[PDB]
């Protein structure tokens, strides 16, 4: 659903974040706000989001760290997405 999410980030730093801090790393569309990213994640993956941080990379794309609540596992979502 929605156009907020462009692609998951499959970098080693992202994978470490998934393993440790229950965080999923996404590359999303620039005009999206933090509420938009939170709502998109919650609706698409049926998970509860605890926090959202955003930045704009030197390439001009928006990257979002979405920290999920302890009740849901980010590893499960990564496996569902094929992140491994």
């Amino acid at each position: 659903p929605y156009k907020v999410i462009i692609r998951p980030v499959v970098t080693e730093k992202a994978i470490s974040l998934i393993e440790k801090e229950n965080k999923l790393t996404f590359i999303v569309d620039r005009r999206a706000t933090k509420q938009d990213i939170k709502r998109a994640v919650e609706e698409i993956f049926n998970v509860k989001v605890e926090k959202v941080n955003t930045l704009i990379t030197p390439r001009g794309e928006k990257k979002a760290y979405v920290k999920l609540k302890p009740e849901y596992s980010a590893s499960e979502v990564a496996a569902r997405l094929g992140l491994f």
Binding site: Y2, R7, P8, I44, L81, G82, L83
Partner: protein
């Protein structure tokens, strides 16, 4: 997908299919960035053009329904 089969389905099914195609397109872009065994490099293109077809036919159905109702 073909325009005929897209026209066969209803607007709600078109929206659902659009959502599924968007999610799959995101998944495949992530997989492309991750791995190197690109068995089907054209999946992204096919999904994107199918999305375009679905949206176009949805707009056509909306316009024709409005014209018929009016």
């Amino acid at each position: 997908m073909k325009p005929s089969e897209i026209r066969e389905m209803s607007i709600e099914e078109i929206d659902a299919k659009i959502r599924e195609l968007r999610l799959q397109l995101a998944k495949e872009r992530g997989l492309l960035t991750m791995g190197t065994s690109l068995e089907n490099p054209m999946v992204i293109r096919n999904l994107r053009r199918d999305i375009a077809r679905l949206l176009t036919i949805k707009k056509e159905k909306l316009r024709e329904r409005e014209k018929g109702k009016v």
